[PDB]
Design a protein around this ligand. Structure first.
Ligand SMILES: CCCCCCCCCCCCCCCCCC(=O)OC[C@H](CO[C@@H]1O[C@H](CO[C@H]2O[C@H](CO)[C@H](O)[C@H](O)[C@H]2O)[C@H](O)[C@H](O)[C@H]1O)OC(=O)CCCCCCCCCCCCCCCCC
Ligand code: CLA
Ligand code: CLA
Ligand code: CLA
Ligand code: CLA
Ligand SMILES: CC(C)=CCC/C(C)=C/CC/C(C)=C/CC/C(C)=C/CC/C(C)=C/CC/C(C)=C/CC/C(C)=C/CC/C(C)=C/CC/C(C)=C/CC1=CC(=O)C(C)=C(C)C1=O
Ligand SMILES: CCCCCCCCCCCCCCCC(=O)OC[C@H](CO[C@@H]1O[C@H](CS(=O)(=O)O)[C@@H](O)[C@H](O)[C@H]1O)OC(=O)CCCCCCCCCCCCCCC
Ligand SMILES: CCCCCCCCCCCCCCCC(=O)OC[C@H](COP(=O)(O)OC[C@@H](O)CO)OC(=O)CCCCCCCCCCCCCCC
Ligand SMILES: CCCCCCCCCCCCCCCC(=O)OC[C@H](COP(=O)(O)OC[C@@H](O)CO)OC(=O)CCCCCCCCCCCCCCC
Ligand SMILES: CCCCCCCCCCCCCCCC(=O)OC[C@H](COP(=O)(O)OC[C@@H](O)CO)OC(=O)CCCCCCCCCCCCCCC
Ligand SMILES: CCCCCCCCCCCCO[C@@H]1O[C@H](CO)[C@@H](O[C@H]2O[C@H](CO)[C@@H](O)[C@H](O)[C@H]2O)[C@H](O)[C@H]1O
Ligand code: OEX
Ligand SMILES: [Ca+2]
Ligand SMILES: [Ca+2]
Ligand SMILES: [Cl-]
Ligand SMILES: [Cl-]
Ligand SMILES: [Fe+2]
Lengths: 334, 202, 168, 137, 97, 35, 171, 243
């Protein structure tokens, strides 16, 4: 056909080693830009005045960091939610000072990962698959939106978005506990249930299927040689697996339907991680974890502490120390 | 359904930001102060207090070297200092009387602050939209006493959750609708498996 | 060398005791109590409302035994230095140069021995479980019986789980 | 320990006269203090001016002395700065500025006594924690 | 040798009494009648060569002067310490509760 | 900075245009079954 | 949890980090495997609900490994091809994770922490303009210790007068 | 005229007002009237830093720097009495205003120079017998430069002057003396020097405008290192009033 119809045929081709697709056409450049900026900044960027108090924090390896302490540092609190592209700055010198690379990385990354999700829908359509893998991916993606975009929005600043580094991430967690008591938030609790459960059922499923592989290999060769790519027969015996698990707990506590079993494997961590994302996205608007501080009172009115109150004492330590030069007035309101 | 789900998710998200930032169609008199507004009210409250005490608020240098009460935005406008620097885009009827062409006006700050402005700023500072899920108002380390969560937090949080699940609903139904229109929503035909008819990748 | 035992006193001549660092703490404040545990002096963080600083309380320190025996120090920075050492208990002079020492505590052989052995003991538990399992299940290491009767894994077909002769 | 008649006995006036509150007034005082005051004075501190707290010793050194029912009742009618030099009804809630502090509109004299009673009783229960702020949480 | 000037000041009368030349204004709340009106005036008109000089502040009512007189035993004066007086720190020194 | 801005605007418009026209070009038909 | 952060700086510890990788990687493997099976199912029934189109005793795979493999290869660049490997890997990742966290906790029994990076401390001690996220988090820890210890460790009878408590400006 | 919403985000809020090319007049001074500057505005256009050579036989030059803190540099709303002296000179005595801005500039090679750009406590004078302020009038004066960080500021390990630790707590047993400079915070107070060269006058309005150059020390990080010498140049504007 015409040049365009050939292009369309290529973009959407089921035969490319890596699927491109229309989402891919946005995904490829945005992810490349984010990746490249990230790598260069992580290695070489100068210190960033994250809290807009002229107190530049060093993130990069060349400026005295290791893999663990290193980061791409959030953009200046003096910027807030203003859009700070490279052309808004008088120079790259200024751009680097104010944390411009962070906005560039997280914006291209979020667009790219959103397209990564669209691309998963797309390929499954091209391949005649059912379409919901992309929905499972919406859970980590939502979590990434929570810490890089929604939280900044609620709090009025990208300086409060998660830093793009290991120790930075911990800083974000700790300040978050001080300001929102995230541990006492039931959406975070559902998140824990989601990831602890996800790990558990992973270990379980892995182990139940493995324990049930049909004898196909010699006593010396890997059992993996007992399964061939594309074979039509199922490589393990699900009835034996159920016979084991149904007896481990009780019969009806166990799955004999592979389809409902794999559904539960998809649903449990995905829903729990949705709640995690929504925990962060709703504490973005300062609806916080349960507060039982001084909840138990004695007959006279003496406060009888609980474990909630010892949590409070730790949160207070975080609160008063964090960003030790940034507050001038008595309440931290964002 | 899926198209409508997508448009509702989008609208939910817009609604979340509307109630969070906007104080015209969500008047702070009824809905409580915005987060930015309450943060701006705190700096105004202490500026008032301290200047009453004799402080020259324009030339008071804070620990970092930036002005304790007043400083410049990145484009030069006079704005409140401390953390609330981020909130300098806030505009509110108790505050605009002090704003001149260059931002907050030091002449007006020194002479023209009316009692009703002090009152509203104290009110808004102390009704910031922060509180716990069990409706203890305050920071997360606050003791029980005040039963408050701003209507703004309830409206933003609820609608972020709703907009979010609607987006999922959109992906679910869009993807299911595509598959059902093409005829493979119930699974792969074992005897016409598309991948088996394609060249191998490598 | 031992520097000798530091005794601290306020301007009243009352003996003061530095609260010792518990092991849990990487860093620890300097607080001096009287013999009944009442706070008498400290090293403040915020100074503007300080009430118990060494300067205000006239804290001095005298040494008995060791290198500094019979000496008394009244310069506040000096007294404050000895008190920071006193959170570690008895005060010693060290050579920090021969080894380019960094001033940060390390454990001893007792600590290193304990760590390696508790870790190796725990990992040896997995080793036990693994080999025990290989021992008792040798017959199924390459997989289960390719035609294991569905009756032995389904329910109520046998009286005793696994026993073919307990058929109903 | 109990909320006893001794705990509930507080100075009525500057001249050493006491008054014993009932448990019901105490509870009333706590309720109405929450209703009208705690947004700024939760815990005996003052959010909008932390230099001034509701500690008994602080109240005693106000002018006029506010460490008694009568002093507190009068504060709630016609609040002053700490040196009594200035009338701050325009920026501090009181019966005098119930037009602009609308929660003040249905506080009766008896309500004012109950709140004063709360303010004087709490530190007798909580000690330094009353007016102590976060250090004491 | 280098010295922390604030710690040093705690060794002088600034560590014992309200120093009219240095002490942050919230300290005046500790005595009847000083805060906010006299405290504002004392800080605005500092430094003082002696404690008594506080009585020579222009515009004082008679009871104002009398309150000053009653509280002189609680005051002191030392040299202006730059670190205590810069940054408007006499008005707000960054300490709340 | 201005040329940078203009270059990027052009870049982004190009890719956005590809994405829009791309899905406008009979996407539902691009599947292996019913077309 | 918070005690471990403040006192042991447990987040810095590489054995806890492998733990996190195993737990989050396990949860990822769980979500991704369950979703992949469910979206490469064969049509073995007429029902628009597909759960009934499975038989525990049936010989055949209920989903296409072939399509699943092609999908991930083109999406992510790599895919499983061996189902026995895939499942073994699902056992391996979270199990190994939890084992690693255990080793770190054995370390913490002895206060043998991964608390500090000495090179950062020396630079920071000598250069008061040097700051990283690692220095920032230690100030948080020192806040946690000072503020929680007196009520959390009552047998120590800690009395920390207000003036000694570490605090930043205002707060 | 222009309102806040005309100006917001343009850069104009950091710009001192200018005078027309017709503003070449003379503003008469009556030695019997008292005056004030009701608004002094200083907009920097160049920051120069004096290089520090390895041998002090080389002549050290002021070199250009790049501004990295954006349009947050101008001093404004400054006011104070304008005295007429015995000899007819004028003296400006600054009483108040937005009279400092923390500024960071970068040397070639990337060294960052923080400074507290300021005219705090400015006392500036003209030449004698100033019967009118003209485009030939100049002010020359001195001002104070207090520490760039005020006394509560805590370094990254928590150490400070009026607050903070007094030691390097991460090195519990290191020797103190080598770290004394880092551990014992100090608060500088130095002098700076400024010159204001009038170039425009509206006699009908009391407004003047011209160029200025000042010199002051940069941040010494609370005693931790030696400050550099900075030279700031820009435009100014002032409104004089009978008062
Ligand atoms: C564990 C349980 C097991 C889980 C499995 C069961 C399925 C889940 C259902 C949860 C069960 C909840 C029990 C309901 C009790 C309750 O809620 O009780 C609370 C109230 C009723 O109690 C009253 O609650 C009030 C709530 O405060 C409110 O009222 C105050 C006084 O006027 C203040 O104005 C304050 O500002 C305002 O917040 C006060 O505290 C009153 O004293 C008290 O009597 O129920 C209400 O309000 C009714 C409101 C329900 C609508 C919810 C709206 C949610 C919007 C946000 C969505 C996103 C947020 C997600 C985060 C999670
Ligand atoms: C797919 C390609 C792509 C996309 C989507 C982006 C996107 C972005 N770039 Mg990146 N970039 C790319 C490729 C891309 N870049 C490449 C190849 C390079 C190297 C040359 C760069 C180098 C670069 C730099 C140096 C910077 C960016 C920045 C940005 C951001 C702002 C761009 C902007 O203002 O557009 C404005 C242009 C438009 C709005 C044009 C759209 C006009 C159409 C006709 C209207 C339709 C739009 C509509 C709202 C929605 C689309 C349809 C929808 C319904 C599906 C944004 C995250 C900046 C940033 O990160 O700041 C923090 C920044 O500084 N880019
Ligand atoms: C639990 C379910 C639930 C509940 C209880 C609410 C409740 C609410 N929503 Mg949410 N919503 C939900 C689910 C829900 N929503 C979901 C799933 C979505 C999509 C994600 C949304 C999206 C949404 C948006 C986008 C908005 C709300 C808003 C609101 C609030 C106002 C509703 C309103 O006025 O509608 C409008 C009512 C109608 C369209 C019905 C017709 C109304 C007529 C035209 C009004 C006539 C008025 C006029 C003056 C009369 C003239 C007469 C004259 C001649 C005298 C209310 C608190 C608003 C808000 O407060 O957000 C912060 C808002 O902007 N909701
Ligand atoms: C996370 C965002 C996201 C994703 C991955 C999808 C995915 C999908 N959509 Mg939905 N959509 C969304 C949000 C999304 N949607 C929203 C918020 C709306 C409300 C307007 C819609 C409205 C919609 C309609 C009306 C249709 C779909 C359809 C589809 C499906 C087919 C592909 C398609 O036509 O895409 C179209 C994609 C969009 C309309 C939005 C994609 C947004 C992402 C973020 C990419 C944007 C890239 C952009 C060029 C970058 C801007 C850069 C900027 C700086 C200029 C596919 C499952 C089609 C389908 O088959 O329905 C059953 C269809 O007809 N969608
Ligand atoms: C991304 C965030 C994240 C993630 C994924 C993890 C993940 C993990 N953490 Mg870390 N944590 C984090 C952040 C995180 N942490 C942060 C920021 C901190 C602050 C420093 C901590 C502080 C922390 C501590 C202090 C500890 C962990 C531990 C762990 C491990 C716990 C494993 C487990 O399931 O134990 C759950 C418990 C078990 C699995 C034991 C067996 C339980 C039996 C089977 C229970 C049977 C129940 C029975 C049926 C009854 C039910 C009754 C019902 C009524 C309740 C795991 C690697 C632990 C660890 O490392 O262990 C070695 C640990 O002690 N974490
Ligand atoms: C001293 C004396 C007196 C001694 C006498 C002793 C004696 C004789 C006692 C007998 C008397 C007696 C019974 C007393 C009772 C005492 C008592 C009640 C003890 C119980 C205490 C207790 C809490 C026990 C256990 C609780 C328990 C097991 C909780 C588990 C709940 C739970 C999460 C269940 C799982 C539910 C679920 C949906 C699981 C599926 C998820 C999963 C594992 C997926 C992986 C998976 C599953 C499959 O399904 C198949 C197929 C495959 C492939 C696969 O991947
Ligand atoms: C107190 C007042 C009460 C009112 C309030 C109620 C509100 C709550 C609403 C919730 C109802 C949801 C019902 C959905 C059932 C369903 O999934 O059907 C789909 C399949 C079909 O089941 C399968 O059913 C099949 C038959 S069929 O498909 O249904 O026809 C069969 O073949 C198969 O063996 C069988 O397992 O369900 C299953 O596979 C069984 C196990 C999984 C079901 C629960 C998990 C789903 C989400 C996980 C939970 C996440 C939360 C944890 C967070 C960390
Ligand atoms: C700083 C930023 C620098 C950016 C780097 C630029 C990278 C450019 C890479 C070009 C690849 C895009 C062209 C592929 C497009 C392509 O190669 O198409 C191949 C296509 C093959 O046709 P068929 O549809 O028959 O193939 C299936 O022919 C065309 O339609 C044209
Ligand atoms: C929220 C909804 C949870 C389900 C979404 C999981 C996503 C995992 C990734 C895709 C995994 C995937 O591909 O799944 C596919 C799986 C089976 O597909 P089928 O095509 O057979 O059925 C779905 C449609 O085709 C309609 O028949 O879908 C379901 O089982 C839907 C169950 C809906 C149950 C009713 C609505 C939602 C309630 C679920 C229970 C939650 C309880 C709340 C507790 C707090
Ligand atoms: C748009 C494209 C997006 C591109 C993303 C690029 C993704 C790179 C993919 C991983 C490639 C490495 C695989 C080597 C290993 C390799 O070649 O595996 C290929 C292997 C193939 O599995 P089979 O089932 O074919 O193997 C047969 C077995 O029986 C072996 O005997 O896949 C797996 O084992 C899956 C589980 C590991 C998946 C691990 C992913 C790890 C993520 C990386 C984490 C560290 C990152 C460090 C950051 C500095
Ligand atoms: C900023 C957004 C831009 C706004 C534009 C949106 C307005 C709508 C304009 C629609 C007009 C174009 O209409 C659409 O375009 C492309 C390119 O011409 C066509 O062309 C395509 O046809 C078939 C469709 O099966 C494809 O297989 C083929 O590869 C391609 O050539 C579409 O079949 C046509 O339906
Ligand atoms: O910046 Mn980051 O952190 Ca959210 O809170 Mn406010 O602001 Mn800042 O202090 Mn707390
Ligand atoms: Ca050495
Ligand atoms: Ca001239
Ligand atoms: Cl921090
Ligand atoms: Cl602040
Ligand atoms: Fe499986």
């Amino acid at each position: 056909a015409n040049l365009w119809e050939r292009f369309c045929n290529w973009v959407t081709s089921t035969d490319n080693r890596l699927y491109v697709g229309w989402f891919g056409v946005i995904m490829i450049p945005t992810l490349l830009a984010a990746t490249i900026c990230f790598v260069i900044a992580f290695i070489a960027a100068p210190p960033v005045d994250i809290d807009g108090i002229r107190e530049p924090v060093s993130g990069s390896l060349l400026y005295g960091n290791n893999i663990i302490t290193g980061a791409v540092v959030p953009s200046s609190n003096a910027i807030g939610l203003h859009f700070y592209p490279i052309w808004e700055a008088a120079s790259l010198d200024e751009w680097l000072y104010n944390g411009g690379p962070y906005q560039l990385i997280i914006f291209h990354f979020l667009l790219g990962a959103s397209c990564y999700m669209g691309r998963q829908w797309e390929l499954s359509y091209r391949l005649g698959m059912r379409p919901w893998i992309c929905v499972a991916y919406s859970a980590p993606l939502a979590s990434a939106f929570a810490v890089f975009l929604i939280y900044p929005i609620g709090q009025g600043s990208f300086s409060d978005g998660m830093p793009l580094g290991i120790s930075g991430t911990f800083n974000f967690m700790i300040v978050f506990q001080a300001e929102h008591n995230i541990l006492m938030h039931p959406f975070h609790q559902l998140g824990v249930a989601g990831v602890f459960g996800g790990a558990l059922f992973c270990a379980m499923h892995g182990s139940l299927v493995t324990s049930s592989l049909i004898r196909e290999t010699t006593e010396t060769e890997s059992a993996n040689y007992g399964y061939k790519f594309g074979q039509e027969e199922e490589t393990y015996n699900i009835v034996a697996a159920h016979g084991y698990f149904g007896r481990l707990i009780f019969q009806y506590a166990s799955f004999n339907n592979s389809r409902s079993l794999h559904f539960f494997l998809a649903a449990w961590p995905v829903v729990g991680v949705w709640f995690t994302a929504l925990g962060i996205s709703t504490m973005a608007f300062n609806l916080n974890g349960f507060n039982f501080n001084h909840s138990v009172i004695d007959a006279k009115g003496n406060v009888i502490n609980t474990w909630a109150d010892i949590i409070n004492r730790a949160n207070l330590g975080m609160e008063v120390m964090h960003e030790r030069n940034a507050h001038n007035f008595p309440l931290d309101l964002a | 359904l899926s198209y409508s789900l997508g448009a509702l998710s989008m609208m939910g998200f817009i609604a979340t930001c509307f109630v969070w930032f906007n104080n015209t169609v969500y008047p702070s008199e009824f809905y409580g102060p915005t987060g930015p507004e309450a943060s701006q009210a705190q700096a105004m409250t202490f500026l008032i207090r301290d200047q009453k005490l004799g402080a020259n608020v324009g030339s008071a240098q804070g620990p970092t070297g930036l002005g304790k009460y007043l400083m410049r935005s990145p484009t030069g406008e006079i704005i409140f200092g401390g953390e609330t620097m981020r909130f300098w885009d806030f505009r509110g009827p108790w505050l605009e009387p002090l704003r001149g062409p260059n931002g907050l006006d030091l002449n007006k700050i020194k002479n023209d602050i009316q009692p009703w402005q002090e009152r509203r700023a104290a009110e808004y500072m102390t009704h910031a939209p922060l509180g716990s899920l069990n409706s203890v108002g305050g920071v997360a380390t606050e003791i029980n006493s005040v039963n408050f969560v701003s209507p703004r937090s309830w409206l933003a949080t609820s609608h972020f959750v709703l907009a979010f699940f609607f987006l999922v609903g959109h992906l679910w139904h869009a993807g299911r609708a595509r598959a059902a229109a093409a005829g493979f929503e119930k699974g792969i035909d074992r005897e016409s498996e598309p991948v088996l008819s394609m060249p191998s990748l490598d | 060398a031992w520097k000798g035992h530091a005794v601290f006193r306020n301007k009243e001549g009352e003996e003061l005791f530095v609260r010792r660092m518990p092991a849990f703490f990487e860093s620890f404040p300097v607080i001096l109590t009287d013999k009944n545990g009442v706070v008498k002096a400290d090293i403040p963080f915020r100074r503007a409302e300080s009430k118990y600083s060494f300067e205000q309380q006239g804290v001095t320190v005298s040494f008995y035994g060791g290198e500094l025996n019979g000496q008394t120090f009244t310069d506040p920075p000096t007294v404050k230095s000895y008190a920071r050492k006193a959170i570690f208990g008895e005060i010693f002079e060290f050579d920090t140069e021969t080894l380019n020492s960094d001033g940060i505590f390390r454990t001893s052989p007792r600590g290193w021995f304990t760590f390696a052995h508790a870790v190796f003991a725990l990992l040896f538990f997995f080793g036990h479980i693994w080999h025990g399992a290989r021992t008792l299940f040798r017959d199924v290491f390459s997989g289960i019986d390719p035609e294991l009767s569905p009756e032995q894994v389904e329910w109520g077909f046998y009286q005793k789980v696994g026993d073919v002769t307990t058929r109903r | 320990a109990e909320l006893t008649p001794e705990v509930l006995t507080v100075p009525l006036n500057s001249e050493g006269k006491t008054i014993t509150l009932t448990e019901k007034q105490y509870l009333e005082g706590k309720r109405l203090f929450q209703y009208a005051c705690a947004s700024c004075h939760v815990g005996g501190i003052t959010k909008t001016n932390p230099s001034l707290d509701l500690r008994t010793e602080t109240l005693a050194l106000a002018t006029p002395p506010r460490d008694n029912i009568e002093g507190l009742v009068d504060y709630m009618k016609n609040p002053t700065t700490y040196d009594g030099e200035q009338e701050i009804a325009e920026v501090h809630p009181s019966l005098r500025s119930a037009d602009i502090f609308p929660k003040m509109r249905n506080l009766t004299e008896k309500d004012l006594v109950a709140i004063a009673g709360h303010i004087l009783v709490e530190p007798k229960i909580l000690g330094d924690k009353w007016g102590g702020g976060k250090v004491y949480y | 040798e280098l010295v922390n000037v604030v710690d040093e000041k705690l060794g002088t009368a600034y560590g014992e009494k309200i120093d009219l030349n240095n002490t942050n204004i919230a300290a005046f709340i500790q005595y009847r009648g000083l805060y906010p009106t006299l405290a504002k005036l004392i800080v605005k008109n500092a430094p003082y060569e002696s404690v008594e000089d506080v009585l020579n502040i222009p515009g004082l009512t008679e009871r104002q002067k009398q309150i000053l007189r009653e509280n002189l035993e609680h005051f002191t004066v030392t040299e202006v310490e730059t670190a205590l007086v810069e940054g408007g720190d006499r008005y707000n020194n960054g300490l709340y509760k | 900075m201005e040329t940078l801005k203009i270059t990027v605007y052009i870049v982004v418009t190009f890719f956005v245009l590809l994405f829009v026209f791309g899905f406008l070009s009979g996407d539902p038909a691009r599947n292996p079954k019913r077309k | 949890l918070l005690f471990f952060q403040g006192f042991h700086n447990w987040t810095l510890n590489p054995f806890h980090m492998m733990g996190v990788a195993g737990v989050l990687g396990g949860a990822l493997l769980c979500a991704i495997h369950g979703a992949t099976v469910e979206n490469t199912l064969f049509q073995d029934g007429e029902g628009a609900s597909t759960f009934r189109a499975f038989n525990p005793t049936q010989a055949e795979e209920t989903y296409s490994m072939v399509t699943a493999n092609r999908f991930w290869s083109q999406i992510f660049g790599i895919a499983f091809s061996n189902k026995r490997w895939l499942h073994f890997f699902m056992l391996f990742v979270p199990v190994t994770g939890l084992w690693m966290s255990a080793i770190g906790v054995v370390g913490l029994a002895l206060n043998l922490r991964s608390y500090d990076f000495i090179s950062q401390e020396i630079r920071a001690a000598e250069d008061p303009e040097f700051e990283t996220f690692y220095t920032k988090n230690l100030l948080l820890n020192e806040g946690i210790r000072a503020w929680m210890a007196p009520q959390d460790q009552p047998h120590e009878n800690f009395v920390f007068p207000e003036e000694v408590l570490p605090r930043g400006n205002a707060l | 005229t222009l309102t806040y919403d005309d100006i917001v985000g343009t850069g104009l809020a950091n710009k001192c007002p200018t005078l027309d090319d017709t503003a070449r007049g003379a503003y008469p001074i009556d030695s019997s009237q008292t005056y004030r500057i009701a608004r002094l505005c200083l907009q920097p256009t160049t920051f120069l830093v004096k290089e520090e050579p390895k041998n002090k036989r080389q002549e050290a030059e002021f070199v250009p720097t790049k501004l990295v803190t954006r349009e947050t540099t101008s001093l404004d709303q400054i006011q104070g009495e304008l005295k007429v002296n015995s000899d007819g000179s004028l003296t400006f005595v600054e009483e108040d205003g937005i009279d400092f801005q923390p500024v960071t500039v970068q040397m070639a090679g990337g060294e960052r120079i923080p400074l507290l750009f300021t005219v705090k406590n400015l006392v500036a004078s003209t030449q004698p017998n100033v019967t009118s302020i003209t485009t030939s009038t100049d002010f020359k004066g001195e001002f104070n430069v207090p520490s760039y960080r005020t006394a509560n500021f805590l370094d990254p390990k928590g150490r400070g002057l009026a607050s903070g630790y007094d030691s390097a707590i991460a090195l519990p047993q290191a020797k103190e003396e080598e770290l004394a400079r880092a551990n014992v915070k100090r608060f500088s107070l130095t002098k700076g020097q400024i010159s204001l060269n009038v170039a425009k006058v509206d006699g009908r309005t009391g407004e003047i405008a011209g160029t200025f150059e000042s010199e002051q020390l940069s941040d010494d990080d609370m005693g931790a290192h030696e400050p550099h010498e900075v030279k700031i140049q820009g435009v100014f504007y002032a409104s004089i009033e009978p008062a």
